[PDB]
Structure 1
Amino acid sequence: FSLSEYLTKFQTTDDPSRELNVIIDQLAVSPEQIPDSLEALIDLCHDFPHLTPKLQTQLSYLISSSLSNLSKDIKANLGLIPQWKRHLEEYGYLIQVLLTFLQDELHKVSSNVELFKRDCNQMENLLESITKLLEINLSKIFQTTPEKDLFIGLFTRPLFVLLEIEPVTKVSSLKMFIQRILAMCVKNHGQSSSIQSSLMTNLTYFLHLSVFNAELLKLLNDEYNYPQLTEDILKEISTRVFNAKDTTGPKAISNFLIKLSELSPGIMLRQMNLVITLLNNSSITLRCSVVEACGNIVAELAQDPQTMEHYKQQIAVLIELLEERFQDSNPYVRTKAIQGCSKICDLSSKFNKSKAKFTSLAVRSLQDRSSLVRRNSVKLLSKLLLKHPFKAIHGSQLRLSEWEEYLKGSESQLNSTSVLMKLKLMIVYYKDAISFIKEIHKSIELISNLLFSKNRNEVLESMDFLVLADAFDIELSEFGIKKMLHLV
């Protein structure tokens, strides 16, 4: 038939057991048997909402079995091409009709349990059938690209519409099936423009589909090794503009970026240069998401030495930007930056040089007006003090007098081939240790002055930090304990 005529007709629209049995009998010999039987199938599909659940179940099973048999035949064998095309078009329109009708009555429910389970089973069967259908390649069948694009949209659009309702997303099986079918659509059949636009529409209009988008992108990156779609999506996010009234859009974008950074740092890191340009926006949630994504990317990429070595310049630029972001109008962006720095410093194997910078920024931020920023800075200092690289010699002991005496001894030893630079490295290490100890002492004094705060969480974190600093022998720790003693 005609694509446009049937599409327009369906876009504007408001004893069956005997015919179903006749259709089953005719299609049992071969699915290709589909004169007047086509009208009977169309009428039966149009009567789907008014049929009984059992008759619907047999109809769906017959349709899925016939379609799977046709797909298996197309796998097996690969003037006869056009009738293959006609059969494929008829089955595609029939699948559109049945799946659009099944999408109805699902928004009404949970706006029961047995109906939901039956609908989920029918969805699983239809997803298996459509996966078998798309397993073949449609390139040779449709010589021209607009017809192929329309045929693929014929199948992709109904599932995109059915993904609107939340309960379908919660089940793992249907979500996984939709993810793999979208991945095969993007990779095996190209059309990286319609799918990305549909995902952007869903992410702008809905909040619960951000994790779905991130998981689909991760699945494409891992097995289908097609990072171009993620690059284009990130570019569109960077160039996207939001109105001053809506806030669900930026929140969904932020959630999608956070989940993507949690999932695949490496693929999304490539376009981070253009993503940084989005940080200038006045939106709060997007800035927080960018900071959180940067922190997670640099933390998870730390495990692979090759990733750090190959991407030194941009990771260094990102870390410098994160350090500079310690001051902002929004306290929440500063809190996100401190949390990202804590995630970076959770490991002490590498980036020892940046530890001093993080300590200096945390000590400076200790005087911030916001209470949450102060608590996060206290947490960062506690994490830094719990594990530090300064443990190879005389570990777990930070005494200013002893370290100063050791530095003086090293200076005297140098004053009195490998010796020269060996003593130079020892002296610079001891100077770094002295600077770190002085910074910790100043932070301890500031937190001791800060103990008297209205918020209880700040007081608790200050007490925890002071106890941790007392665990290591510190000359000024007793002053902190004395100040804490007045908390009664």
Structure 2
Amino acid sequence: LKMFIQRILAMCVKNHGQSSSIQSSLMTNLTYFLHLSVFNAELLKLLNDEYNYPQLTEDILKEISTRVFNAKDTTGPKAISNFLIKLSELSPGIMLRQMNLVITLLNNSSITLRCSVVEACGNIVAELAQDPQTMEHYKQQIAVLIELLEERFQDSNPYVRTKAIQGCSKICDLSSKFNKSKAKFTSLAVRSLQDRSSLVRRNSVKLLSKLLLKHPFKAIHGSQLRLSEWEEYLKGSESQLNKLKLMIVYYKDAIS
């Protein structure tokens, strides 16, 4: 019944029918009831992959981005939270087009929407890792999100910091690019290794273990990472330098 309702609504939006009416009814589903968020994300995914009409997803992200929440509305934040999490999990390429409007919610006082959009940036960078459409189609929209995840290590409530560290730790698994950012993630993790909450500290230990198991210094010597041997490797630059000076820079960043 769920896929039948999804296909009826998708046929209504795509070929013939008001996208505004279905859009406002989806927003009322996100407003009043907290269980229909996964249904909304799956309907927009069915629009994004089969009927290739992605304007409704951008319109939903627009109208979510400009929304004011009542002080006693403990439901709408959670519905938009699970909706943005599931839409980052399901359709990240269509969600990347309006993320500069989506991340406006990072100054809303609700903790749940901040953790939602931080996990959305983490999942939206972590899925755009398969190579031949990522590093040239969207290059600065992914870099501003990497920098945004770096800045969210300093939020007031520690759950947003925990979601930032978890998004950074799921970024560091798949590495076909952005190997410059791993050193900054290491620096942010060893800075945040002594915070106030135990949760952000524990997740920073997990992030350091994740980036230590997959350090990019492979295919030379067996990757055992001693400061003595790599310092003698850098001391060999007198025998090397004074075309392969990138190996000297390699040894310096590994020493750091």
Counterpart contact for 2:129–2:176, Cα < 8 Å: no
Unaligned runs of 5+ in 1: 1-173, 416-421, 433-486
Residue of structure 2 equivalent to 1:441: none
Q: For 1:425-447, what per-residue CA distance to the aligned partner results, in whole angstroms no more than 9, with x for missing partners?
A: 11100000xxxxxxxxxxxxxxx
Alpha-carbon deviations, 1:407-435, whole Å to 9, x = none?
111233211xxxxxx33211100000xxx
Task: Name the CA distance, whole Å, in 2 between partners of 1:227 and 1:348.
Answer: 28
Aligned residue for 1:405? 232
Supply the distance in 1 between the matched residues of 2:75 and 2:62 (Cα, whole angstroms).
20
Q: Is the 8 A contact 2:34 2:79 kept in 1?
A: yes
Residue 305 of structure 1 deviates from its aligned partner by 2.8
Alignment deviations for residues 168-222 of structure 1 (CA, whole Å, 9 cap, x no partner): xxxxxx0000000000000111301010000100111111100000000000111
Distance 1:359 1:411 in 2: 29
SS in 1 for 2:241: helix
- Distance, in Å, in 2 between the alignment partners of 1:410 and 1:354 is 25
1: CA distance between counterparts of 2:193 and 2:152?
15
Deviations 1:86-106 (A, max 9, x none): xxxxxxxxxxxxxxxxxxxxx
Contact 2:152 2:164 in 1 (8 A): yes
Q: Is contact 2:129–2:175 with CA below 8 Å preserved after alignment? A: no
4+ residue segments displaced more than 4 Å = none
The answer to whether the aligner puts 1:427 opposite 2:254 as a matched pair is: no
CA deviation digits over 1:57-87, x for unaligned, max 9?
A: xxxxxxxxxxxxxxxxxxxxxxxxxxxxxxx
Indicate the structure with greater helix content. Answer: 1
- TM-score, normalised by the number of residues in structure 2: 0.97
> Which protein is bigger by CA-based radius of gyration?
1
1:247 positional shift: 0.9
Deviation at 1:264, TM superposition (A): 0.3
Determine the C-alpha separation between the residues in 2 that align with 1:380 and 1:326: 13
Q: Is the 8 A contact 2:169 2:210 kept in 1?
A: yes
- Note the aligned Cα RMSD (angstroms): 3.0
- The aligned runs of 1:192-211 (5 Å cut-off) are 192-211=19-38
Per the TM alignment, residue 307 of structure 1 is displaced from its structure 2 partner at its CA by 2.5
Q: Is the 1:348–1:387 contact (alpha carbons within 8 Å) kept by the matching residues of 2?
A: no
Confirm or deny: 8 A CA contact 1:210 1:255 kept in the other structure.
Answer: yes
* Greater relative CO (CA pairs within 8 A, separation 6+): 2
Question: Counterparts of 1:307 and 1:224 in 2: how far apart (Å)?
Answer: 23
Task: Give the C-alpha shift of residue 343 in structure 1.
Answer: 0.7
Decide whether the 8 Å contact of 1:348 with 1:388 is kept in 2.
no
CA distance in 2, matches of 1:281, 1:229: 24
1:268 to 95, 103, 125: 95
Once residues 131 and 36 of structure 2 are traced to their aligned partners in structure 1, the CA distance between those partners, rounded to angstroms, is 30
Between the two proteins, the alignment pairs up a number of residues equal to 255
Q: Is the 8 A contact 1:301 1:308 kept in 2?
A: no
Choose which of 196, 206, 212 in structure 2 pairs with 1:385.
212
How much does 1:303 deviate?
Answer: 1.5
Percent pairwise identity: 99
